[PDB]
Amino acid sequence: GSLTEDGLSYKEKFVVRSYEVGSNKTATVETIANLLQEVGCNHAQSVGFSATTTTMRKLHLIWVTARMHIEIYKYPAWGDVVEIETWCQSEGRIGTRRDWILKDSVTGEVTGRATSKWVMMNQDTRRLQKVSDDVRDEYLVFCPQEPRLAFPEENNRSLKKIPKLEDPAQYSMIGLKPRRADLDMNQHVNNVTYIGWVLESIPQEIVDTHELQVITLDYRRECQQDDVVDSLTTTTSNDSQFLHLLRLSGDGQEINRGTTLWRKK
Amino acid sequence: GSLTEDGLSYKEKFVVRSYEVGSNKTATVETIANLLQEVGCNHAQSVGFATTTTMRKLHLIWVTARMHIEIYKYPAWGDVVEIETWCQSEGRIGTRRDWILKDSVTGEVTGRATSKWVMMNQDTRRLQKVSDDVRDEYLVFCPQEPRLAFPEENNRSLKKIPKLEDPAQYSMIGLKPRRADLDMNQHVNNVTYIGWVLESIPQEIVDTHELQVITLDYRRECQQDDVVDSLTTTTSDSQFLHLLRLSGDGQEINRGTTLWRKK
Ligand SMILES: Cc1cccc(NC(=O)[C@@H]2CCCN2)n1
Ligand SMILES: Cc1cccc(NC(=O)[C@@H]2CCCN2)n1
DSSP: OEEOTTSSOEEEEEEOOGGGBOTTSBBOHHHHHHHHHHHHHHHHHHTTOOOOOHHHHHTTEEEEEEEEEEEESSOOBTTOEEEEEEEEEEOTTSOEEEEEEEEETTTOOEEEEEEEEEEEEETTTOOEEOOOHHHHHHHHTTSOSSOOOSSOSTTOGGGOOOOOOOSSOSEEEEEEOOOGGGBOTTSSBOHHHHHHHHGGGSOHHHHHHEEEEEEEEEEOSOOOTTOOEEEEEEEOOOOEEEEEEEEETTTOOEEEEEEEEEEEO | OEEOTTSSOEEEEEEOOGGGBOTTSBBOHHHHHHHHHHHHHHHHHHTTOOOOHHHHTTTEEEEEEEEEEEESSOOBTTOEEEEEEEEEEOTTSOEEEEEEEEETTTOOEEEEEEEEEEEEETTTOOOOOOOHHHHHHHHTTSOSSOOOSSOSSSOGGGOOOOOOOSSOSEEEEEEOOOGGGBOTTSSBOHHHHHHHHGGGSOHHHHHHEEEEEEEEEEOSOOOTTOOEEEEEEEOOOEEEEEEEEETTTOOEEEEEEEEEEEO
16 A cells, blocks of 8 residues: 555555455445545555544544445455555635546556545534635645546536435345444444445345446444434336435434446356 | 465565444454454465365355454454464364454463364355365365364363253343345355343443453354344343344354453
C-alpha cells in the first residue's frame, strides 16, 4: 500500500484468501466491498487522517455513506493478486465522492470499479449538513483538481434514481440481526453487512446460475446493534434485474433500497 | 507464506485490517481464527493438496472435533502478526494441527492454538478410525518427534467439557448463518460457531474483559437452513460454560468454555 507519485491517489495489492471465496472459488462481493473499505482507510491514514479532518473533529462531524455502486467484470480467484487504486473528490457543498478501480495484478486489466457518495453528519444528532468552506479546503489538498471519475459515461448507472419496492415482495429474508463480527471499531454496523443482507433475499438458484455484475445501494438510515432487519426482493427484468429493500422488522422503517444486475454463467 | 527449512512447518505474516478489529482497535478472536484457518490452507497447498489421494478415492475428509485458542496479546490494527503452523499424527484417532502466534516486530509469542481433526465419510458423515495407507501419505509432511503448542501436562486443551444445564444464565436465540458464513463447499465456516458461542456473553463482560482462552467441542454440523440457540452460564478472572443447540429440537451442535481477564 502506497500513494502514487503525485500523492493524489492510493494503491494496494491483496492476495485473495480461502475464507474470502464462494462456491465458484472466486471472491464474494462482500470480500470486494471489505477490500475497497480497507484501501480507503489506508489512503486516509497515509495522508494524516483519523477520515475526519481537524475542523470536523472540533465540530463533532463525520462522513457517512449515502450511496455505494459496485460493478464487477471478473471476480478474483482464491490465491490471485488484486490491485485496487482509490481516490477522493469534492462534490461542492453536497459532500465527497470516493472512487475505486480493481485490476488483476498479473494481467493489468480492469476487472471491476466502484463509486461512493459520502454526506457530512453530526455524530451525535445524526443531522446531515452541507460541507462548509473551512472543511473543503482541508481535504482539497489530497484530491485531484480536475475531475477523475471511475464511472465517467454519458448515462452511467451509478447516478440512477432507485424506486421503493411495493408490497408484496417476490422474495424475502426475515429476522436478520447483526452479530459482533458485523460491528466496526466504533460499534456501528459495517456497511458491507447491508450488502450481505440485501443479497439474502435473492434465491439460491439465481446465485448458483448467475454472477453478480452490478449493485447499487442507497443508505437512508443506520441499523442499530439491537435492531432486526427484513430483506425484500422483486424481479424487475441472459440478464436479471432486481429491486431491493431493507427495512426494520418491526415498524417497517426503511434503512436501505437498491438494485442488482446478474448475468448467466 | 512459506515452509520452513525442513519443510515440516509453514509460516505466514499478516497485516491486521480495519474491519478485522473490535472496539479496542485490536483483532477479534474471529479474525485470529480466520488467520489460523488461512495459514493452515496455505500449508496444505504448499505441500500438494485438505484431502489426500487415497482420501478423495474413498470419499473421506478431515473435520474439526476440537479447537482450543489461547491469546496473551491481541494484535492491533496495522500490526504484523506471524503465524507458524504444523500437523501431527495421533495414531488411529486422527490428526492434530498446532499454531504459534508471534508479534513480527518483537518476536514474542502473543498467542497459541491447537485443534483435533477426525476422519469422516463426506456422504454418510460416519467417523471411523484412520487407516495405515492414509497415515503414510501425510507422515512425510509432519515432524516425527512430538512438537506441541500446548506441551504442559494437565493443560486446558485436553480437559473434558460438561453439558450446560437448563436454565442457562444468558442466551442468544434465532441465530441463522448467511452466505458470508458459508465456505467454498457451502458448509458453515467453523469460525461462525465461535462468533455464535460468544453472542450469549453479555456486552458488559466483553467491554470490561479480554478473552484469554476458548475451547470448543464440535458434535454436529449446522446446515445453511438451520437455526441456532447460544447458551451461557458463569462457572467461576471469569469462566463460562457454553452450549450451541438447534432452535427447534434442541439437538446439540457445540459445547465449550471461555476464560476472560480484567483489562
Ligand atoms: C445517508 C445516511 C446513511 C446512513 C444513515 C443516515 N441517517 C441516519 O442514521 C439518521 C436518520 C435521520 C437522519 N440521520 N443517513
Ligand atoms: C466431530 C464432528 C464435527 C462436525 C460434525 C460432526 N458430525 C456430524 O455432522 C454427524 C453427527 C452424527 C453423524 N455425523 N462431527
